RNA sequence: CGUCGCUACUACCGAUUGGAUGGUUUAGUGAGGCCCUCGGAUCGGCCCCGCCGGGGUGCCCUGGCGGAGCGCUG
RNA sequence: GCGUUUACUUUGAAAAAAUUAGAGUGUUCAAAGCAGGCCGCCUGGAUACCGCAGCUAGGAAUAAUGGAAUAGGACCG
RNA sequence: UACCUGGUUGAUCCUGCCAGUAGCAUAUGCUUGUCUCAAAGAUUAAGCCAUGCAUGUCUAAGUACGCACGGCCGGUACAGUGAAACUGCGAAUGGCUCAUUAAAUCAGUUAUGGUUCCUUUGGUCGCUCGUACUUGGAUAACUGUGGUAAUUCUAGAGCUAAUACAUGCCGACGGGCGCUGACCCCCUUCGCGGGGGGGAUGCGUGCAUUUAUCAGAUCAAAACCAACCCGGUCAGGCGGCUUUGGUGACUCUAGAUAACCUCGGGCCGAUCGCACGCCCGGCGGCGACGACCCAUUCGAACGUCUGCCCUAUCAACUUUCGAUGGUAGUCGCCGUGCCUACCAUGGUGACCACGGGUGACGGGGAAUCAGGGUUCGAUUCCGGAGAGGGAGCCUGAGAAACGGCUACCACAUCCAAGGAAGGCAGCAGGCGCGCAAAUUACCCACUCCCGACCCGGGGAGGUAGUGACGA
């Protein structure tokens, strides 16, 4: 080719959107932004297929143009704006502040929070760039460059930033004994404690994650997102809290579900 | 012995011209647990492609082989072996792949048929894309 | 693009050749010089009209401009008039008044945070000298082993 | 234009790479600069990514550093003597790198006559016909004379520069290329290269 | 089982430098574009000469006008 | 943060979707499709599989290859 | 479902073939009442093409004296609409086909510590030091005469705007640092002293960019003569002290000194619109924008490892025509024979090099199948190649682009015979070649894309018509 691509085919779209086959040919291109392509979720789906607040593509255009949605502190009007991991979608007209957390299966489900809680978010740091004639910066995983960080906070740590000032409050150093959120691979949406890390110079390191139910699996470190110290997490969680029931246990939760309700 | 060339050979990083009352020698490590040889620091050889005293890093893969030809200058030829596997017939077959490897002069006791361990780097020439990290001896025969 | 042109020397140049007059005419020829056709419009620009119509630094251009009475078919003619080119400063003050105060704000933001980082190291320096004077004071106790 | 591809030539073993595309624009090569020593003339050239490279067709002046006492100086150029690639890039003057230049550079008397408390040359017994170097040397003070006393006893130039402040030598050969960077900044050398180069200016002899 | 004898069939060798087509390919010329060296049509313009205005302190700049080094330079 | 090896075997990461194999659903059934079911409510949109090589991690039967015999022998001072 | 039957002989047991049998996908014949899905000029000719279409754009916010039109409170210049010019924005995506290409393309795999990246998100925006109450001059639309058989052909005169084209202030402001050192103070000895303390003056004072240098960012160790700033002062008498982060690995991000900085120029707002009050000329909030550099995003580009069809009636090849290496350079976004200049004579191969064919585009996959495997993958998804054939280049972040230009060869149009213009392997539709394959219809509503942007466009796409490929 000669320039960059712009369109997107329905089949080549990522799996965790759960788009059907018939309705069309193209899938909406995620705009250039902070998050990766295969790691985000557009507002036009979140407001047309997941929440179903509107049906047609022009009426999505007739929503965010009325200065309603204030993402993490500042209103964007791009109807296909890429919103990814750790974003506080805030609707002013009904107040239903949303947080986008991974389900127990490999997808993004709708998780509501309270407006009291919609004040901060937890960000994973990526690097420390020392700006000479001066001070070090930071680069988190959503590309939030910050000045004057700390002489303590290091490469793979997590911090608790604020919305309207873009400033830190607290932080957690990565030690074996914190929580863990597996962001990517065959364990996309699991939570457990950390028990071991292995060094592979030149190569990439790996980390064993123990589920609360004994199930000890493994995961390379670039999918790790520490959220809490000890056993205690710091935010609310979706329902399940990272069960990952077996495939035959879904028989039980699907059978005695109705039978225990009606 | 040294400087048989039309230009002047030197390491570029050091200033050798202050009020002189031997020059300090440049050398670095490599990582991955490889010791520098004794002959490098003490040695007066100079090169811009040696992985100890030049502007080249060491990255990627690490291989092995065996030395078989030394007629060229500052490069030697090794011979890798492996075994392909047909699954139709439940057997193997032999192959051999060869390559041209840049040789630092810090290694001296290298005869023919010596097990070597190479390392990937930036492309140095048309076909040399590897450096020699260590050279062993074959099955005895010291005499 | 390639085109086809003609030379710059008039040899056989039939087809009209446009005859401009850049010299004074002294006598009366009928078709040309009967009526001084005026300019279709006049100026706009502001230093060009300030200085052009008999005016100094400290006077006012809000009236010295071409009015152009029209003929409509059911109304009175109206003075169509322009407003361009850096009129002196009615409220363009207001944007410079803000531009020179955000420079006071970004300087305030780089003045509040420098000394604050100086205090945050000011805290961790009592420890930066404490840890050397505590651990090496215990290390001589370990060496006396 | 001229290419820098790999496909237009053979493999390692004598075969022929048959071509599978035409010449792409990112495989560009320009004609050479081949600069001279004249007036100042520099062309700007747009490059990949919207950036700019600066050529230099005709060049006169430089910026040469003395790597011992931490000084450098904008400096005039006249001559070309020894090139390490071509015997003919002296006969036709061209300024590229590791070409020793000997570039009269103001013959160490626009530079060396900057507050060094000494004369040199002037076949001995000879003086300066104006009295203006003797002014700098006959002005006394209290403790700044001691200041020149210390910046006088730890300072002796070598003999090879002691004999050569007539025309102005350089082992320099500006380490930046002028056809790509614009300007021309080199560096005077001392010791054990002056022997190698002047040995290459012993065997020249046509 | 074979020779000869009538009909029918496919390739083969072969004449005339038997023959031509099309594709891969050497030595001599070689439109056209791109860097270079100059070229200077041109529009100039200020200054450099000369006039009145005015303000200024006979001259200095400010607005029309007579002329010139091809002066400076884009 | 090394423990001087390959070959072989087991584990662990990593592996584009669709397709295929496969649960769920009563388009009036079916091939398809991913929806829909109760008086504002409740969900779903799973899993498995994925050779040949390279990286990790343990295994030492089999199959190759090594030391001291012109002793320049391997420790210990 | 790991399966068989007829046929040599006067009759029998055999090796062995022939014909049956069932799936599959192209054509064709005969017959054809109904209903849901649904292939379609790829196989010969990547051979040629009339007509009609297939890419443009404005918001409360750059410039509207477009009456083509139309506010009335005018008398201090502008209501909202609203062709053209520019500025930006795109036109480099999307579509269509498979002629080339056999370690090349590709899939998996790893590198950028060897480099560039419009826009988005976030940074930064006095750091650099000595007419501005916004400067200056031209060119569209328009008016007004035209030439030209003909074209999206264009001149001449007059106007006139800019987030275009170019100039160049004010500022915070006092200062310190490094140097040159007018000169300045003090002790002592008679001093020629070594012991000390003050300081005008001139330069200069980031970042980007180029050169050179310094240490850092070192680990456990001692016995002593010339020095003398601190503390023992007991009488020469014996102990000492100050410090950026990483990476497997830096000639990395760093800090400081001497200067260097292109007239075909480097940064420092000489921008507009909504509210909008505050104070004696003075003060906030919001935005649209625009540039420098650091991150980030979509990526792109060069390379690593391993992995392919037939042929020995192709067994030796390459190399002063760069073949394989060493040195210094040139170019280029960077690494290299990519290319010049100088030296050496080497590199692959029966473990199938080299050369030739292919009715070869590759991979995801499809049909039959016990297990093994054979054959097909032109064709809706990813990745590359190409627009009759071959070479060349502009603008631009990005193209050797062809619904963009410059020439050759082949094919080809209108002409007043002076000249002009072109490219369906884009959707439809004809000619042709064939055993061989559909409507010159309707519409932006769906899915989505472009722009200055809620609002205009899209033969991409969708819905219908033909349709016994088939289910
Ligand atoms: Mg492209
Ligand atoms: Mg097999
Ligand atoms: Mg894949
Ligand atoms: Mg054995
Ligand atoms: Mg029979
Ligand atoms: Mg029927
Ligand atoms: Mg068909
Ligand atoms: Mg294009
Ligand atoms: Mg083909
Ligand atoms: Mg081909
Ligand atoms: Mg072919
Ligand atoms: Mg392909
Ligand atoms: Mg079988
Ligand atoms: Mg078969
Ligand atoms: Mg593609
Ligand atoms: Mg071209
Ligand atoms: Mg091209
Ligand atoms: Mg076209
Ligand atoms: Mg054509
Ligand atoms: Mg085609
Ligand atoms: Mg549109
Ligand atoms: Mg289309
Ligand atoms: Mg039908």
Curated annotation (Swiss-Prot), chain B:
Cite the InterPro entries for this sequence.
NA-bd_OB-fold (IPR012340), Ribosomal_uS17 (IPR000266), Ribosomal_uS17_arc/euk (IPR028333), Ribosomal_uS17_CS (IPR019979), Ribosomal_uS17_N (IPR032440)
List the subcellular locations.
Cytoplasm; Nucleus, Nucleolus
Q: Which residues are listed under lipidation as S-palmitoyl cysteine?
A: 50
Q: Which of the residues bear the PTM Citrulline?
A: 20
Q: Which GO terms describe its molecular function?
A: rRNA binding; structural constituent of ribosome
Question: Might you report a single GO cellular component term?
Answer: cytosolic small ribosomal subunit
Domain of life, source organism = Eukaryota
Tell me the residues on which Phosphoserine occurs. Answer: 57, 100
Task: State its role.
Answer: Component of the small ribosomal subunit. The ribosome is a large ribonucleoprotein complex responsible for the synthesis of proteins in the cell. Part of the small subunit (SSU) processome, first precursor of the small eukaryotic ribosomal subunit. During the assembly of the SSU processome in the nucleolus, many ribosome biogenesis factors, an RNA chaperone and ribosomal proteins associate with the nascent pre-rRNA and work in concert to generate RNA folding, modifications, rearrangements and cleavage as well as targeted degradation of pre-ribosomal RNA by the RNA exosome.
* Protein name listed in UniProt: Small ribosomal subunit protein uS17
Q: What is the lineage of its organism?
A: Eukaryota, Metazoa, Chordata, Craniata, Vertebrata
UniProtKB/Swiss-Prot annotation, chain D:
Subcellular location(s): the record lists: Cytoplasm; Membrane; Nucleus, Nucleolus
Topology of the protein relative to the lipid bilayer: Lipid-anchor
Please give the Gene Ontology molecular function terms for this protein.
structural constituent of ribosome
Matching entries from Gene3D superfamilies are given as:
3.10.290.70, Ribosomal protein S8e, subdomain
The record, for CDD domains, names:
Ribosomal_S8e_like (cd11380)
Q: How is the quaternary structure described?
A: Component of the small ribosomal subunit. Identified in a IGF2BP1-dependent mRNP granule complex containing untranslated mRNAs. Part of the small subunit (SSU) processome, composed of more than 70 proteins and the RNA chaperone small nucleolar RNA (snoRNA) U3.
This protein is called what? Small ribosomal subunit protein eS8
Q: Quick one: which gene encodes this?
A: RPS8
């Amino acid at each position: 080719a000669r320039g960059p691509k712009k369109h997107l085919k329905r089949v080549a779209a990522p799996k965790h959107w759960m788009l059907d086959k018939l309705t069309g040919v193209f899938a909406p291109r995620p705009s250039t932004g902070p998050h990766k392509l295969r790691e985000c979720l557009p507002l036009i789906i979140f407001l047309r297929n997941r929440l179903k607040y509107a049906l047609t593509g022009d009426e999505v255009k007739k929503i965010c143009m009325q200065r309603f949605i204030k993402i993490d502190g500042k209103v964007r009007t791009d109807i296909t704006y890429p919103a990814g991991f750790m974003d506080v979608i805030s609707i002013d007209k009904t107040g239903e502040n949303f947080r986008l957390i991974y389900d127990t299966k490999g997808r993004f489900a709708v998780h509501r929070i309270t407006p009291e809680e919609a004040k901060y978010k937890l960000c994973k740091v990526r690097k420390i760039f020392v700006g000479t004639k001066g001070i070090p910066h930071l680069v988190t995983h959503d590309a939030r460059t910050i000045r004057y960080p700390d002489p303590l906070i290091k490469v793979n740590d997590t911090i608790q930033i604020d919305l309207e000032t873009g400033k830190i409050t607290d932080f957690i150093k990565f030690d074996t004994g914190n929580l863990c959120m597996v962001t990517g691979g065959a364990n996309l949406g699991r939570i457990g404690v950390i028990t071991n890390r292995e060094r592979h110079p030149g190569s990439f390191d790996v980390v064993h994650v123990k589920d609360a139910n004994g199930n000890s699996f493994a995961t390379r470190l670039s999918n790790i997102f520490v959220i809490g110290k000890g056993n205690k997490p710091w935010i609310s969680l979706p329902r399940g809290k990272g069960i990952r029931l077996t495939i035959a246990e879904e028989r039980d939760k699907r059978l005695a579900a109705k039978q225990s309700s009606g | 012995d040294i400087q048989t060339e039309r230009a002047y050979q030197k390491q570029p990083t050091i200033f050798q011209n202050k009020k002189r009352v031997k020059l300090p020698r440049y050398y670095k490590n490599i990582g991955l647990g490889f010791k520098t040889p004794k002959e490098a620091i003490e040695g007066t050889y100079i090169d811009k492609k040696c992985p100890f005293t030049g502007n080249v890093s060491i990255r990627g893969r690490i291989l092995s082989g065996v030395v078989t030809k030394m007629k060229m200058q500052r490069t030697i030829v090794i011979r890798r072996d492996y075994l392909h596997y047909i699954r139709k017939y439940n057997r193997f077959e032999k192959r051999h792949k060869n390559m041209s490897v840049h040789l630092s002069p810090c290694f001296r006791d290298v005869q023919i048929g010596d097990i070597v361990t190479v390392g990937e780097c930036r492309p140095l020439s048309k076909t040399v894309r590897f450096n020699v990290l260590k050279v062993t001896k074959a099955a005895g025969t010291k005499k | 693009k390639r085109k086809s042109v003609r030379g710059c020397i008039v040899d056989a140049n039939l087809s009209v050749l446009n005859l401009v007059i850049v010299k004074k005419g002294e006598k009366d020829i009928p078709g040309l010089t009967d009526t001084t056709v005026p300019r279709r419009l006049g100026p706009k620009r502001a230093s060009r009209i300030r200085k052009l119509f008999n005016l100094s630094k400290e006077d006012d251009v809000r009236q010295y401009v071409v009015r152009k009475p029209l003929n409509k078919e059911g109304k009175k003619p109206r003075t169509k008039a322009p407003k361009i080119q850096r009129l002196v400063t009615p409220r363009v003050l207001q944007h410079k008044r803000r531009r020179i105060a955000l420079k006071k704000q970004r300087t305030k933001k780089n003045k509040e945070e420098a000394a604050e980082y100086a205090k945050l190291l000011a805290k961790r320096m009592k420890e930066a000298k404490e840890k050397r004077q505590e651990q090496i004071a215990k290390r001589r106790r370990l060496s006396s082993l | 234009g001229i290419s820098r591809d790999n496909w237009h030539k053979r493999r390692k073993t004598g075969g022929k790479r048959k071509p599978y595309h035409k010449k792409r624009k990112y495989e560009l090569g320009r004609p050479a600069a081949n600069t001279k020593i004249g007036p100042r003339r520099i062309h700007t050239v747009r490059v990949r990514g919207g950036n700019k490279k600066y050529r230099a067709l005709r060049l006169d002046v430089g910026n040469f550093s003395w790597g011992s006492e931490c000084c450098t100086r904008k400096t005039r150029i006249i001559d070309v003597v020894y090139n390490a690639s071509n015997n003919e890039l002296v006969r036709t003057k061209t300024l590229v790198k590791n070409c020793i230049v000997l570039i009269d550079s103001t013959p160490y008397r626009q530079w060396y006559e900057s507050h060094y408390a000494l004369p040199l040359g002037r076949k001995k017994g000879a003086k300066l016909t104006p009295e203006e170097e003797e002014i700098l040397n006959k002005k006394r003070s209290k403790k700044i004379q001691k200041k020149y006393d210390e910046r006088k006893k730890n300072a002796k130039i070598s003999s090879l520069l002691e004999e050569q402040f007539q025309q102005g030598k350089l082992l320099a050969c500006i380490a930046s290329r002028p056809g790509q960077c614009g300007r021309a900044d080199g560096y005077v050398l001392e010791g054990k290269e002056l022997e190698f180069y002047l040995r290459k200016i012993k065997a020249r002899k046509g």
